[PDB]
Symmetry: D2
Subunit: 245 residues, 4 copies
Amino acid sequence: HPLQGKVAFVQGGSRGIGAAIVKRLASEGAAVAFTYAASADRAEAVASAVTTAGGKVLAIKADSADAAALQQAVRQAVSHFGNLDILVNNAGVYTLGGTEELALDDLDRMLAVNVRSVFVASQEAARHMNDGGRIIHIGSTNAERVPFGGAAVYAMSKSALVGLTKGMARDLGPRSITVNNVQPGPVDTEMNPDAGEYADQLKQLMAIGRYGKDEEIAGFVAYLAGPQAGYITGASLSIDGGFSA
Amino acid sequence: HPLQGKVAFVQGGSRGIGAAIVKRLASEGAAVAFTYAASADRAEAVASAVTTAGGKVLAIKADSADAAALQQAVRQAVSHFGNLDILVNNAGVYTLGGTEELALDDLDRMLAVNVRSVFVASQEAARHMNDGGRIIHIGSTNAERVPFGGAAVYAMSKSALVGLTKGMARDLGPRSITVNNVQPGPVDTEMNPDAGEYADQLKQLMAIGRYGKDEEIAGFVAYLAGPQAGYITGASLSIDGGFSA
Amino acid sequence: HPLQGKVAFVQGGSRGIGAAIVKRLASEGAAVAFTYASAVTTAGGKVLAIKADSADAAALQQAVRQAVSHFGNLDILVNNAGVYTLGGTEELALDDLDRMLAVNVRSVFVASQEAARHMNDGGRIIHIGSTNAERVPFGGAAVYAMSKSALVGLTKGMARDLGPRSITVNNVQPGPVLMAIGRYGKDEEIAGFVAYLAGPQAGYITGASLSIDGGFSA
Amino acid sequence: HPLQGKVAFVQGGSRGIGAAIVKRLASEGAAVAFTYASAVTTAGGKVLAIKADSADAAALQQAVRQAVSHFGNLDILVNNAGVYTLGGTEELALDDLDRMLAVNVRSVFVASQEAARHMNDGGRIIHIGSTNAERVPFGGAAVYAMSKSALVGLTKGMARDLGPRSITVNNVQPGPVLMAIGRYGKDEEIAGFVAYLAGPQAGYITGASLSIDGGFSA
């Protein structure tokens, strides 16, 4: 239980990758607060998974487009569990549109979920974080490799995380808080499933030939959140099957 | 006159780097439309510099925080000069604040000038651009090297350009339009002058030991805008005195 | 014991980071052969120490094959040999150039090739690079940094070659063992990252250059 | 003639990109010596062609010094020698490994060192790398990519060493001469980028790896 006694906050913990992160951090001993945007039933089920197995959980409904909500959610977590040790930012909107076609609203949307709320959650978490803590952003391999049209704003929003990570690492390093950007490739989720033609075409660009699993992302995040990873900071860390080789 | 007959649009052309870009592109033969946010007198003087020397110019007052304004400015340029060949995005806000201290408004501000309006100007320019055109974003070496605290959101906003550039290059490549991100280091301007203690400390991190000059940035932008640079696309191109080595 | 039943080869496993890597892999249940014709081992033990130098391609090849004779095909190779010699561009001796190329670059490929000839599908190759591949703040490091940035291309291309066999290939980039965290790293932290990548949870990480540098390169 | 009065050395200047580089630099007014004990030149001319191979460090050193005897200290060195041999990790012959290391890596440092010994302040060193240092989409390229990603660290560190002399050091990364633009590049486009970096407007560009690849690496 490498995270016994620790308190983690997961922005977007109710489904896919975020649910697996919640469950792995709890399995390792952390008490976990997480936000969900949509489904109370889904969040209830993730919470139960933490509890049936002996872990402590708080689910918080919050819209990641609303900065006030995110700040309120962090404060509510800290009232529930005490100061944070770990923040994982996993809100994320993957929408395609060409440069000449994308609507001004889908843009301003990926900006608010994928960039602005990552900063806002990080700032409020840092204000309530123990020294020796961990902040992990979930970016994308499209920060490094954009093989097709339609991903310009999505890739912009994820490469934003590279400079955020570097500069936050400098800010928070004197507190011994690490800041890292985990860059996944394709991962099998219910809205991006490993199925169909587009999945086959993506697999052809990967050295591994398969989609990643939610639990593999969660295993990397849990390593970075743990006691062996205090020297890892400022980094953009690819876990992408070789997509970006 | 490698740009004879060409039409360029410069977002932020009235001062510093943007004024030097305007003057160099006009000197090479382009007709230049440029936006300015603040000073009609400054913009009038840049316009005169283009004209006294025999070039064609249009100055447009526009707030780079206002997407409608930027779209209107591009349309007004195209009515004045015809379809664009070149877009240079040089709006830019360099504000420092630690992660735990930066105000929600300074953040949402660097986001609007340094990220969102670069996309918005690019989209509207692309809709009115000839094939074989050029789009040049002005990013920063802080996308690659963040040596001190206080630059997290600034560096986020500039590393955003890396993925924008890659994805826009894919979108616009079939039109033979190149898309590049010029990443300057410190440059001697009236608001960031090569003078004082902070300038000396920055120079110590540079291999060159001096600030860059506005005309050196303009020379690189003019090369990238020209007829010898049609193979350069998707790139993030450092011109930083070795800051980021 | 996440590495129970697995077989590892560590090039440069006799002190510092290399010794911490050998210790950690063995503690997780791997058989470990390492370099640092002579060998030492313990009866009933699963750690084999081989003295052979990282300069001669036939020797290094032979050491790999010795390990396979003891233990079977490899699952894990870690390339951790490394020579660090400072010199300005105008002054560096050609013999120092040649030593850094032979140890830091050529021996990495030689060991990787031999390992790949005798490796189970689902294996792991981990190169030990440096954060100097990304940030070179001072003079004197040009050829050292060159030798370490070489591993970035090697990793990418080796990941493409070996991916059809489900073998991952990554480049771990340490910093000192400029800093954002205010201390140097510990050998055991570098070993814990290599052990993670060597294990069963890390099959989707490939082709990557992964920095563990205290924020040196930020 | 932005290079009037300047002296350039081009390692590998006899065909393709190298020949386009020699032509462009000379057209801008430079004296140009290039490699491709024998030499040819024209009476009254400022282009000197030297046959010496990019393998032997004393020879390459000698060619540089020959150029300095004709023309004076250098202002510009362009390293454009290059060997491209495909082979998977498991199969590549060690002699092909060794040839790519000697030509693509070691000869780049040897020429750079000799040039730096005989170079005016305010000079320029330009290495010709490859976009394969950043994107390796297919198998077969591991050692080629390794040899070319080596130049990234070299460039960074050489920029730090030579910056006090105002000498810039950059790495030009071509693509084919995956694509975003839908054609391969022309030799003369690579030469125009090298000429820009070699000129008087480019003194603030240093340490950089600068891609000219049609968007291959995007």
